[PDB]
Amino acid sequence: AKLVRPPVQVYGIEGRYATALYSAASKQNKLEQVEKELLRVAQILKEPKVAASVLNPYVKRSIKVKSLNDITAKERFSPLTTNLINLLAENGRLSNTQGVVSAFSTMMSVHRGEVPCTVTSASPLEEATLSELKTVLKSFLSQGQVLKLEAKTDPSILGGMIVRIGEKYVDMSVKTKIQKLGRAMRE
Amino acid sequence: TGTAEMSSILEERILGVDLEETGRVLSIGDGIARVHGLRNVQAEEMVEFSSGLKGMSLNLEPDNVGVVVFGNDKLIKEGDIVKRTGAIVDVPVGEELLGRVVDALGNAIDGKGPIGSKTRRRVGLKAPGIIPRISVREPMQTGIKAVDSLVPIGRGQRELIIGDRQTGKTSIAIDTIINQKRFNDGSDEKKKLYCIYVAIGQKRSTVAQLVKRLTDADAMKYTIVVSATASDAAPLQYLAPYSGCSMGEYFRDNGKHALIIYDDLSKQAVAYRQMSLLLRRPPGREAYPGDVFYLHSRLLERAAKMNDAFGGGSLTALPVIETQAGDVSAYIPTNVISITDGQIFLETELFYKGIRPAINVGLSVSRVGSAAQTRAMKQVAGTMKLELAQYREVATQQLLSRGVRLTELLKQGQYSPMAIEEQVAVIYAGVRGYLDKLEPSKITKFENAFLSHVVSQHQALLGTIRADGKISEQSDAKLKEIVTNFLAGFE
Amino acid sequence: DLEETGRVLSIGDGIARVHGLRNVQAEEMVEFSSGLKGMSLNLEPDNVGVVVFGNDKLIKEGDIVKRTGAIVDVPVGEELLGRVVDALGNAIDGKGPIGSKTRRR
Amino acid sequence: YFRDNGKHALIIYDDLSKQAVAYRQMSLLLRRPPGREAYPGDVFYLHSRLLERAAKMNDAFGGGSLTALPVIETQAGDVSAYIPTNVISITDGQIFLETELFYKGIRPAINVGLSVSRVGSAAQTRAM
Amino acid sequence: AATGRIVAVIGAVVDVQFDEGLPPILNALEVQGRETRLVLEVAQHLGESTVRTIAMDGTEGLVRGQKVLDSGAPIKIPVGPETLGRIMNVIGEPIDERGPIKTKQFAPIHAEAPEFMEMSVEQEILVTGIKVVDLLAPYAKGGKIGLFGGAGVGKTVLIMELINNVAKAHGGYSVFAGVGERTREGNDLYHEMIESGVINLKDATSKVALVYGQMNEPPGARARVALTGLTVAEYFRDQEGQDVLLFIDNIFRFTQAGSEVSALLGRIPSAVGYQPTLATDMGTMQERITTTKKGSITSVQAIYVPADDLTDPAPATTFAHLDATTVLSRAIAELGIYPAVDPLDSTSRIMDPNIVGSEHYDVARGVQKILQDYDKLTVSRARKIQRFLSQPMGKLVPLKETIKGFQQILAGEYDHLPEQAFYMVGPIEEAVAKADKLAEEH
Amino acid sequence: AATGRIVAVIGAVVDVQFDEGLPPILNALEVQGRETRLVLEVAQHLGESTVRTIAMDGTEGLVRGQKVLDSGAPIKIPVGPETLGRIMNVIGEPIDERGPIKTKQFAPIHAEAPEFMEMSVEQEILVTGIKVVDLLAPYAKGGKIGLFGGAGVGKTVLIMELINNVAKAHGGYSVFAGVGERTREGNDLYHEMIESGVINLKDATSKVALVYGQMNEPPGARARVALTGLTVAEYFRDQEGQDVLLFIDNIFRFTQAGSEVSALLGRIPSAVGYQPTLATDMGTMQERITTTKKGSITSVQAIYVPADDLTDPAPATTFAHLDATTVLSRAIAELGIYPAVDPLDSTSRIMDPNIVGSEHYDVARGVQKILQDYKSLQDIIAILGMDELSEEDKLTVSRARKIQRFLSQPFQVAEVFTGHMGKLVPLKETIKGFQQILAGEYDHLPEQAFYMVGPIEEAVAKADKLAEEH
Numbered sequence A: 001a002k003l004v005r006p007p008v009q010v011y012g013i014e015g016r017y018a019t020a021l022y023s024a025a026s027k028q029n030k031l032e033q034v035e036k037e038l039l040r041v042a043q044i045l046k047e048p049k050v051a052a053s054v055l056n057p058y059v060k061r062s063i064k065v066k067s068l069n070d071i072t073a074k075e076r077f078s079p080l081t082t083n084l085i086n087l088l089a090e091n092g093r094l095s096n097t098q099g100v101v102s103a104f105s106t107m108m109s110v111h112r113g114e115v116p117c118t119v120t121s122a123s124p125l126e127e128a129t130l131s132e133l134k135t136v137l138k139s140f141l142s143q144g145q146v147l148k149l150e151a152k153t154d155p156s157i158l159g160g161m162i163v164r165i166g167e168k169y170v171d172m173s174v175k176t177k178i179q180k181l182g183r184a185m186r187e
Numbered sequence B: 001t002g003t004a005e006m007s008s009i010l011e012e013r014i015l016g017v018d019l020e021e022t023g024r025v026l027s028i029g030d031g032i033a034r035v036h037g038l039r040n041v042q043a044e045e046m047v048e049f050s051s052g053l054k055g056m057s058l059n060l061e062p063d064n065v066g067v068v069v070f071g072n073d074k075l076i077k078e079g080d081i082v083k084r085t086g087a088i089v090d091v092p093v094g095e096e097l098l099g100r101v102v103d104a105l106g107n108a109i110d111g112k113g114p115i116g117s118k119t120r121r122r123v124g125l126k127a128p129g130i131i132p133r134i135s136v137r138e139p140m141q142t143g144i145k146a147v148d149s150l151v152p153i154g155r156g157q158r159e160l161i162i163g164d165r166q167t168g169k170t171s172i173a174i175d176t177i178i179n180q181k182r183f184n185d186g187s188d189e190k191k192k193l194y195c196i197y198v199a200i201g202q203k204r205s206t207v208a209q210l211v212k213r214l215t216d217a218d219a220m221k222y223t224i225v226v227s228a229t230a231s232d233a234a235p236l237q238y239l240a241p242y243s244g245c246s247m248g249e250y251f252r253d254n255g256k257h258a259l260i261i262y263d264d265l266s267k268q269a270v271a272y273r274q275m276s277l278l279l280r281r282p283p284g285r286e287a288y289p290g291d292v293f294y295l296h297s298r299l300l301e302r303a304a305k306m307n308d309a310f311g312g313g314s315l316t317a318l319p320v321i322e323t324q325a326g327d328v329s330a331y332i333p334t335n336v337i338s339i340t341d342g343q344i345f346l347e348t349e350l351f352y353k354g355i356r357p358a359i360n361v362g363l364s365v366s367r368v369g370s371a372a373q374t375r376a377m378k379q380v381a382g383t384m385k386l387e388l389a390q391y392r393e394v395a396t397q398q399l400l401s402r403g404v405r406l407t408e409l410l411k412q413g414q415y416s417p418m419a420i421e422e423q424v425a426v427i428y429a430g431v432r433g434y435l436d437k438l439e440p441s442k443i444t445k446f447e448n449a450f451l452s453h454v455v456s457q458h459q460a461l462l463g464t465i466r467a468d469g470k471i472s473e474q475s476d477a478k479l480k481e482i483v484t485n486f487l488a489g490f491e
Numbered sequence C: 001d002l003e004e005t006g007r008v009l010s011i012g013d014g015i016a017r018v019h020g021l022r023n024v025q026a027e028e029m030v031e032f033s034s035g036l037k038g039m040s041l042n043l044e045p046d047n048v049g050v051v052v053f054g055n056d057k058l059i060k061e062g063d064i065v066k067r068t069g070a071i072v073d074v075p076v077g078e079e080l081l082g083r084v085v086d087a088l089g090n091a092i093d094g095k096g097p098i099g100s101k102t103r104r105r
Numbered sequence D: 001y002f003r004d005n006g007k008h009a010l011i012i013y014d015d016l017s018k019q020a021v022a023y024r025q026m027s028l029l030l031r032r033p034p035g036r037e038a039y040p041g042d043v044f045y046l047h048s049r050l051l052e053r054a055a056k057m058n059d060a061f062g063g064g065s066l067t068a069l070p071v072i073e074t075q076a077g078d079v080s081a082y083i084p085t086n087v088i089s090i091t092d093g094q095i096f097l098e099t100e101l102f103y104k105g106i107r108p109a110i111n112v113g114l115s116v117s118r119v120g121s122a123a124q125t126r127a128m
Numbered sequence E: 001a002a003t004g005r006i007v008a009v010i011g012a013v014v015d016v017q018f019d020e021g022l023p024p025i026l027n028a029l030e031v032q033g034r035e036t037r038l039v040l041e042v043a044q045h046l047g048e049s050t051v052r053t054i055a056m057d058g059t060e061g062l063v064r065g066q067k068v069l070d071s072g073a074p075i076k077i078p079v080g081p082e083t084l085g086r087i088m089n090v091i092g093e094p095i096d097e098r099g100p101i102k103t104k105q106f107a108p109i110h111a112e113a114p115e116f117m118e119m120s121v122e123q124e125i126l127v128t129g130i131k132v133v134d135l136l137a138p139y140a141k142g143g144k145i146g147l148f149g150g151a152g153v154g155k156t157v158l159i160m161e162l163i164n165n166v167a168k169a170h171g172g173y174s175v176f177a178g179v180g181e182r183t184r185e186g187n188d189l190y191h192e193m194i195e196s197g198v199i200n201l202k203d204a205t206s207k208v209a210l211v212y213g214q215m216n217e218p219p220g221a222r223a224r225v226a227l228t229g230l231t232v233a234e235y236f237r238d239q240e241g242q243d244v245l246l247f248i249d250n251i252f253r254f255t256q257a258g259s260e261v262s263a264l265l266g267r268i269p270s271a272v273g274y275q276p277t278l279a280t281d282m283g284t285m286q287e288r289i290t291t292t293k294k295g296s297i298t299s300v301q302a303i304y305v306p307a308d309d310l311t312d313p314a315p316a317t318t319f320a321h322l323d324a325t326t327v328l329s330r331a332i333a334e335l336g337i338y339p340a341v342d343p344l345d346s347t348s349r350i351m352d353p354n355i356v357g358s359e360h361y362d363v364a365r366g367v368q369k370i371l372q373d374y375d376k377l378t379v380s381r382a383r384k385i386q387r388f389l390s391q392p393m394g395k396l397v398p399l400k401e402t403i404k405g406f407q408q409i410l411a412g413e414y415d416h417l418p419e420q421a422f423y424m425v426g427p428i429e430e431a432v433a434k435a436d437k438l439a440e441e442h
Numbered sequence F: 001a002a003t004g005r006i007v008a009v010i011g012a013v014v015d016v017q018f019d020e021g022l023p024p025i026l027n028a029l030e031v032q033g034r035e036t037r038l039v040l041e042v043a044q045h046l047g048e049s050t051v052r053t054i055a056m057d058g059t060e061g062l063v064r065g066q067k068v069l070d071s072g073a074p075i076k077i078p079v080g081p082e083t084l085g086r087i088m089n090v091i092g093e094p095i096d097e098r099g100p101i102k103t104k105q106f107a108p109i110h111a112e113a114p115e116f117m118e119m120s121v122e123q124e125i126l127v128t129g130i131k132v133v134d135l136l137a138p139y140a141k142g143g144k145i146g147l148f149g150g151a152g153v154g155k156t157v158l159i160m161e162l163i164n165n166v167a168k169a170h171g172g173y174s175v176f177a178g179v180g181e182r183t184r185e186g187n188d189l190y191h192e193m194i195e196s197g198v199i200n201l202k203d204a205t206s207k208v209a210l211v212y213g214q215m216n217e218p219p220g221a222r223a224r225v226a227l228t229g230l231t232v233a234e235y236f237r238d239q240e241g242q243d244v245l246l247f248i249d250n251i252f253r254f255t256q257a258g259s260e261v262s263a264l265l266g267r268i269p270s271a272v273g274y275q276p277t278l279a280t281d282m283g284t285m286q287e288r289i290t291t292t293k294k295g296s297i298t299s300v301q302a303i304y305v306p307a308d309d310l311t312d313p314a315p316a317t318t319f320a321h322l323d324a325t326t327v328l329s330r331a332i333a334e335l336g337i338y339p340a341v342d343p344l345d346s347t348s349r350i351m352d353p354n355i356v357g358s359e360h361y362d363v364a365r366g367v368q369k370i371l372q373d374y375k376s377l378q379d380i381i382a383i384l385g386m387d388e389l390s391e392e393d394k395l396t397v398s399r400a401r402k403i404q405r406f407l408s409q410p411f412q413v414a415e416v417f418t419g420h421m422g423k424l425v426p427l428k429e430t431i432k433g434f435q436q437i438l439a440g441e442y443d444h445l446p447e448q449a450f451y452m453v454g455p456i457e458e459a460v461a462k463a464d465k466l467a468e469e470h
């Protein structure tokens, strides 16, 4: 049977399960719905009590997914999402579901067309030039794209900035320019 | 990770065809199809692919089935439908197979028409236990002086023909098959031996030459030839010995006597090693799987002599083994030497020294021994064997010259299997001393002339020795008579 | 208490994989439930590979494993002279217990 | 570069046994299946794709050349080893240096009976 | 009891998943829905309620999901005097077609070896009659013997001679364990025991119990059939006080079956190809064969040496587990000398002057020395001795008689008789008589 | 047809993911976006609609996500008489710079072996003019031959002498497949066949088609070029009935290339290190090189022996596929005896008194017997010296050394090495000379009178020259 390949490919068991979920949702047009669904179930699991109930390797799989059936029939969950968690407890891949959730998030954030940019500076950036370079950054992408710009700071790069547009990468740092000048002066 | 954790199964399992009697190919490669589904299939059950190809469910795994393909995988794609047929392998057996050349599944490949047998038999059947058998008593005549004298084989024995490449193993098996023409042409029913030749991993031209050699010796009308050649899939070369063994077990279970030749088992072990390594089973010594002794053992243990309450039939096995550079300390030679009832060891140095058949009597053995010999051959062979052992340990001038005389006596040409009476005549002429006056290079010329003479002149003596089986005192005097006269008249 | 007390996850041919025991030291002697003893030879992220001073037939997946806090040690001293002990210093000559006063790694 | 521009280069690889050892290190660290003497299956390809580039072009491709003198170090004079026989299968001849001749003052210790040059005569002067 | 399901079937290894009631290691499980009984012995716990198991007969026709019942105990075989004269396979079913084995007691084949305080020191030599064995490396009651050899040196015929002489001259309920040996030879041994009165099919007075796990069986069966024979002999010692004989033939089949189970049991292989668990598993087996204060089990073990090596892990591991090993060599077997016992490789722990005595010990050492050094008179005496070590009609040569004969040859008292008057004869008397006849004719 | 994307590149192994229309195994795929045509042959189906493929050329410059197009059929090469006089590579493209090969039909290089009912049995000796070959292991018309040899023992010189003699005397569309050999040797063969008129660059009446994948090619090309040449020969045999000669040199490179790619296909290594599928690959390839009732293929194959083993799985497995093996030896070539054929290791299926006659058969068996006796004596000959042998033993050693020397022969293609002119000894001269040396008719000649001669007349002449000059 044909399968809908997402625009990004994630790998591992997380990648495979999330690719399955995406190609399932794309044939029924329920993608953001199931994102809110897995958001909910991720916050279901992140609380410690039944997190320990489900990561216990001394439960019987029947017991663990019985509690899972219970709590998934509680929150009127979609058959798609209940089925996914049923499969993760069947294959015993349950403890990794956060990752799958993780994967799905990333996947559809390139479905909405977001590009993650990271600007490292030597100084905590000003607001003005922050959004200045935001406007500058905007011009690289096609329309339908949204910058997820997250500028952290590292004061060792000796000035300038290091901007990562996805995997594209401009190193306008001053430390690296100093290294290049030293290399040219030595060679 | 996980064979059945592919994204397709997973996606249309989360979203929501019979998966009990039908499966889908997850991955095909090198003749190993992993199949999702087939939850009801049995281990070693024969399944059917969409393209008409067959397979054997060898690896029942928690989430998939490793099936070995009986053909070329170019006709199997991922996602193909695999059906159950519900049966383990079976082959057609009966008298309708004599003179036919079939493949590892009982299909005719000589274009003489389909097989017209009425009975089928499984190939993975078990061997007869302790009770149905009885001690090996009747002689299987090979028509080879060295074998029938020093390494005698009986009906129900498993004698191994082991040796390096191009030493004469197939020639020994073929002489043995040709030799039964004197018994199958008569009417005494309990001396007839139906032969089965299993060719595993050979050229098709070699098997064609062999079938022509058997037809030109009129030895095909009682022979079956199972042929899993070099181009055939590894499962078929793996399965051919069992098909042949079932075709012979038909004769065994029904009060007839069958002989089967596995030519050879080294290539069967190679095919099984390929299938097992491709099924990801843990390799062992020389990469061979751990259960290859179990393989050859459950194959060879089906050669038995049944007692009179179970019909009185028999099945004799002559497995063939090829050693690499005379190294019997290998894995498959070790196993098959420990399984069988003795080995006919053929050497390469003995082959070019003119000793042909190149049988190494010092290393050969037969655990049945004289119990599988006629009384006459026993009378001559006891003293011959001890003579040769004494000679070899000090290989004193009398010992040396007598041993050289006997060694020249044991040579024999190809495709000329001698009846047992003439063998006894020769060995008598040679052991009681009548060749001490001949220089060894004329012993062959003697043997030839002497036997021309005793077949032309003394048909009554040979006839009575065939009738009784032993050398009667009157017949003893007549043998001394004839050999003295001939040694006088010889030049 | 999954820091001084683990639970057997697997067993086979002498090797007990034990889940838990987050504070056990490498090559520390632990005590299974059935009285047997073992040594924590492997300290892996998810489990502890313990080697059992006994047989596999008696321990079984799910058993409890306590920890002693000391590395493997034996009794030493004059009191052992004349006595036949096993690899742990326990008397196997039937002459009673060893009155040893000193232990040594 | 010289072979392609109508000039003549000579190249010495000193030696190829150590390159095979380095490639065996890399292959074993890549978890690849080790064959004879733990060497990978494609050590022959390793040396043969290299010694195949030493060619002699014709006058339509410049007329240049590139001569290769690969060096191989044998153990105890064993020439029937794996890598020696690989490179003997690749090259056009050998120059067998012997330890018996070298210790007996015969230097260069060329074994004339075993040294061969498959091309040989076609590339001598007339006087020589 | 506990019910599980088959999840995987690979060759001779079956994985079973139990919902509740996980069975300990070494337990026996029964597969439901089969004509003949198929027992699976547990080997590993794999977590998630799954165990790995070795099948006791072929695994064809098994289905993923087939129910499997738990016995709750290791393989239990019937033990008692009602097993005498019968043939049972590795799981205690009769395979002689004479009906069930109606015994009062069942015993598990996996039991602990005797303790240390139960150990015995008494070593009383048992003389067998053979010149080479009883002279150079004689057997001791209560001790393990062992008969090493390659394929074709004469091990089974040797164990047959031993069965005849010893088991007939004994009153202690012998046991024969056929560990992966030819069905033809097993049937011949059965029929030759019956007609020789050792097995009585009517009015049971039989004194040998046979256990047969043969070559066409899976590796688990050939690995546990020696333990089945052990369990029978252990009953006849523990709860009967008898001094039992245990003929194990052949034990290397036990070792190689261990190799074949380890192959797929999911364990890294050791040297040659055997299991990581060879020495200690063969040890847990071989330590149950001992003389306790309750009774004795003297064990005659024929051992298969692959390719006549004797340095192979299985023979080399067995060597330390035996009290009087007599190795059958191939080089002497091709000499026509029989039995093929190697005089310079057959060691006895009772061949010391505190047990056999002055004269016997001196003869043994002198014969071994004159054979090792093999002065033309010395070589002639050595060849005469090589000939006189042979024993064919069968012979019975008592111990004192043979020490006397080998002394008379050693001292040279008969250096005029030819070399091959000592070949295939009994004591010195038959040797001088064969010299008599062969001399006056030729 | 179907289009997919490269998802992994490891050496010569490329994984291609198709979104729809998965290609059957053995199909050819064209990588899109390359200067020269790169073809991938499908080998496995990994699932996930991914396939694993082996590349017929270099994989450098390949990027994950590159487009790949499915051809719908396996590698198809042009077959016909228009292939004669041309050089083509593994995928049928001309590599001789003479334009496209305009044939009317293309054949897939993967085919089924001829059935059992098509096998032919006829066995007629093929005389090569070589002494040791025609005497101790005669070749057969239409039989597979095979020439085993280590590194640098005379495999290619012997195969070129056989080319010269047989192929030149022949009339049946020879074919030469260079598999993993020296490109220099391929150029040499091309030009010595151009000058001898066997390849006609104009007015095409050529009678040999060449196919070359040499040492410089990646493992996929070296693993399929044998099949390409095999396919050309199969066409000439079946669809024309011609009597084809097929020379393959070297055919161990096919197994070796399979072994080089086997690791990357994710398969557990067999013994030594080869692929688990060594024997069945060799069988599917070697069972198509055969004589049928439709035509005749005389197949000479050079077989490299790694590290002079002969028990290495590749030579050991090749042995069973041949009708007349000729095993060269390094120990013999170090004595100076060429061709270095081992007399006691070369066999034949027509070495039968009912085929070669009792004269030939008895002479061959006697030669081998005397050489075997010499070999068995050699140990004490070199320990104690010959001075201790029996007089009969000294006679057997003398005749054995003479037979050794007489077995050597100068080769027409080896004048550059031997200095002598190549001799072509016909069969009866061989039989008679060896019969005479056996009978004892030359117990007076020096042994060096037999080294590198033609018939025995030249041996007596050389002895006379040695006696008069020295």
Ligand SMILES: Nc1ncnc2c1ncn2[C@@H]1O[C@H](COP(=O)(O)OP(=O)(O)OP(=O)(O)O)[C@@H](O)[C@H]1O
Residues within 6 Å of the ligand: B163, B164, B165, B166, B167, B168, B169, B170, B171, B172, B322, B356, B357, B358, B412, B413, B414, F320, F348, F349, F351, F352
């Ligand atoms: N008794 C014999 N006398 C003379 N020649 C013989 C004899 N036996 C065999 N030969 C010849 O020796 C050669 C090898 O024979 P054969 O093929 O039957 O042995 P093999 O073990 O099957 O070798 P292979 O490895 O090819 O299978 C043949 O040419 C055969 O004709």
Ligand SMILES: Nc1ncnc2c1ncn2[C@@H]1O[C@H](COP(=O)(O)OP(=O)(O)O)[C@@H](O)[C@H]1O
Residues within 6 Å of the ligand: B365, B366, B367, B368, B369, E149, E150, E151, E152, E153, E154, E155, E156, E157, E158, E328, E338, E392
């Ligand atoms: N009395 C005897 N006469 C002749 N041969 C004998 C005698 N006893 C034993 N043999 C020979 O001993 C050999 C070894 O037989 P067997 O006991 O099966 O060997 P093993 O047990 O060592 O494998 C056989 O070839 C058999 O014929």
Ligand SMILES: Nc1ncnc2c1ncn2[C@@H]1O[C@H](COP(=O)(O)OP(=O)(O)O)[C@@H](O)[C@H]1O
Residues within 6 Å of the ligand: D088, D089, D116, D117, D118, F149, F150, F151, F152, F153, F154, F155, F156, F157, F158, F338, F339, F409, F410, F411, F414, F417, F418
């Ligand atoms: N018939 C021969 N006469 C003289 N020398 C030969 C003969 N055959 C081979 N040689 C020598 O052995 C060397 C190796 O030859 P060749 O067959 O090309 O090596 P390879 O074994 O790799 O095919 C040649 O260079 C040649 O010097």
Ligand SMILES: [Mg+2]
Residues within 6 Å of the ligand: B169, B170, B171, B263
């Ligand atoms: Mg053969």
Ligand SMILES: [Mg+2]
Residues within 6 Å of the ligand: E155, E156, E250
């Ligand atoms: Mg035995």
Ligand SMILES: [Mg+2]
Residues within 6 Å of the ligand: F155, F156, F181, F249, F250, F302
């Ligand atoms: Mg070559």
